[PDB]
């Protein structure tokens, strides 16, 4: 009962966060086994940030230029290498708190938990989604560079995001853990613009199901639509088109609830055209698109 923006427990990640300083530039890094992963922007002095030549800056550095602090313990840098936009600092000590992990790239519309960190120190946890324009609507202040996003699958942490920068619109941009940006951005301190964002339709439908599971039923009706008639309406309102694979993903919720996907699509059509008229769904007055079908199952049926 109830429905909240729920993050994954963050303890397994917290013991991996460290602080990385290179001269007067400092940010967060991720310590797994005997490697520390962090944004390569850390080798920039303030003069280099606008237009860095990262290959040039890196060859001018040595291992002792890199200060890595894990709490009070200092870690000895014994090697360094660049992989796309991340720096890999080999250290002399393997992190005894290394969880089982993997590096995965997520798709637009998927959700993950962020551990926001400052000076190597975990500060807070929240859930967000990768937007279709490859930015996230995070909550980050100065000093959060290197903070990570992750999911938990049983025992295993899947890292999927490393925070790099803020865009002029206030949204955030970053890379996967192999250093490849999400979206068309580059790691330099310039004004870069995001493409126009759209609403994640399958998620809105997942959330309507969650509402029906929690006793909000006022928006349902008899009608059924077809994919094509729906998608014609979706596009007018800046919603991602719906596919057959989307419909199939919503299968478990369809079953548990007794409402066909195309049945629920007709309700969504109505909500889009007529609005909500001061009514709320799951305590919201807007259609919420940052819960996936898996988030709903996890919170309305049970997974630990």
Which residues are the active-site residues?
41, 145
Which residues between 134 and 163 bind a copy of itself (CB under 8 A)?
137-143
Q: How far apart are CA 13 and CA 263, in angstroms?
A: 41
* Residue nearest ligand 7YY, CB atom distance: 187
Residue 170 binding target from ligand 7YY, a copy of itself, none, CB below 5 to 8 Å by type: a copy of itself
Site for a copy of itself in 276-295 (CB under 8 A): 278, 280, 283-286
Q: Rounded to 5 degrees, what are φ and ψ at 68?
A: -115, 120
Q: How many CA atoms are closer than 13 Å to the CA of 253, on its beta-carbon side? A: 31
Q: Does 190 engage in binding with a copy of itself (CB under 8 A)?
A: no
Within 13 Å of residue 87, how many CA atoms lie on the same side as its CB? 30
Chain breaks in the chain (C to N over 2.5 A) after: none
Residue 276 CB partners (closer than 8 Å, separation 6+): 219, 285
* Residue 41 contact partner, candidates ligand 7YY, a copy of itself, none, CB within 5 to 8 A by sort of partner: ligand 7YY
CB of 127 to ligand 7YY, least distance (A): 18
Contacts of 240 (CB under 8 A, 6+ apart): 109, 132, 198, 199, 200, 201, 202, 234
Kindly give, in sequence order, each residue whose CB lies less than 8 Å from that of residue 100, ignoring residues fewer than 6 positions away. Answer: 155, 156, 157
The strand pair at 101-103 and 156-166 is best described as parallel
Does residue 242 belong to the site contacting a copy of itself (CB under 8 A)? no
What's the closest the beta carbon of residue 23 comes to a copy of itself, in angstroms? Answer: 23
If contact means CB under 5 to 8 A according to the sort of partner, which of a copy of itself, ligand 7YY, none does residue 164 touch?
ligand 7YY
Identify the DSSP state of 302: I
d(CA 109, CA 292): 7
Residue 191 or 286 having the CB closest to a copy of itself: 286
Q: Which is nearer to ligand 7YY, 189 or 224 (CB)?
A: 189
- Which residues of the chain form contacts with ligand 7YY (CB under 6 A)? 1, 24-27, 39, 41, 140-145, 164-166, 172, 187-189
Determine which residue in the list 124, 184, 195, 251 makes contact with a copy of itself, applying CB under 8 A.
Answer: 124
71 binds, among a copy of itself, ligand 7YY, none (CB under 5 to 8 A by kind): none
Q: Which residues bind a copy of itself (CB under 8 A)?
A: 1-12, 14-15, 115-119, 121-126, 128, 137-143, 166, 170-172, 214-215, 275, 278, 280, 283-286, 298-304
């Amino acid at each position: 009962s109830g429905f909240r923006k729920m993050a994954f427990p963050s303890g397994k990640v917290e013991g991996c966060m460290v602080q990385v300083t290179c001269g007067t530039t400092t940010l967060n890094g991720l310590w797994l086994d005997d490697v520390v992963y962090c944004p390569r922007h850390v080798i920039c002095t303030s003069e280099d940030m606008f237009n860095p030549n990262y290959e040039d800056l890196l060859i001018r550095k040595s291992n002792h230029n890199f200060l890595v602090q894990a709490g009070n313990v200092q870690l000895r840098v014994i090697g360094h290498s660049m992989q796309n936009c991340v720096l890999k600092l080999k250290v002399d000590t393997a992190n005894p708190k290394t969880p089982k992990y993997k590096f995965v790239r997520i798709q637009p519309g998927q959700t993950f938990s962020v551990l926001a960190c400052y000076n190597g120190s975990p500060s807070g946890v929240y859930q967000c989604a990768m937007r279709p324009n490859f930015t996230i609507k995070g909550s980050f202040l100065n000093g959060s560079c290197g903070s990570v996003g992750f999911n938990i699958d049983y025992d295993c942490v899947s890292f999927c995001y490393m925070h790099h920068m803020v865009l002029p619109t206030g949204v955030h941009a970053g890379t996967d853990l192999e250093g490849n940006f999400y979206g068309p951005f580059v790691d330099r301190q310039t004004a870069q613009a995001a493409g126009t964002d759209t609403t994640i339709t399958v998620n809105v439908l997942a959330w309507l199901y969650a509402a029906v599971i929690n006793g909000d039923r006022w928006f349902l009706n008899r009608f059924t639509t077809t994919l094509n008639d729906f998608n014609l309406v979706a596009m007018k309102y800046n919603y991602e088109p719906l596919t057959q694979d989307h419909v199939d993903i919503l299968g478990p919720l369809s079953a548990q609830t007794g409402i066909a996907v195309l049945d629920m699509c007709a309700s969504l059509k109505e909500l889009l055209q007529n609005g909500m008229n001061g009514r709320t769904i799951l305590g919201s007055a807007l259609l919420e698109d940052e819960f996936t079908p898996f988030d709903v199952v996890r919170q309305c049926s049970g997974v630990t």
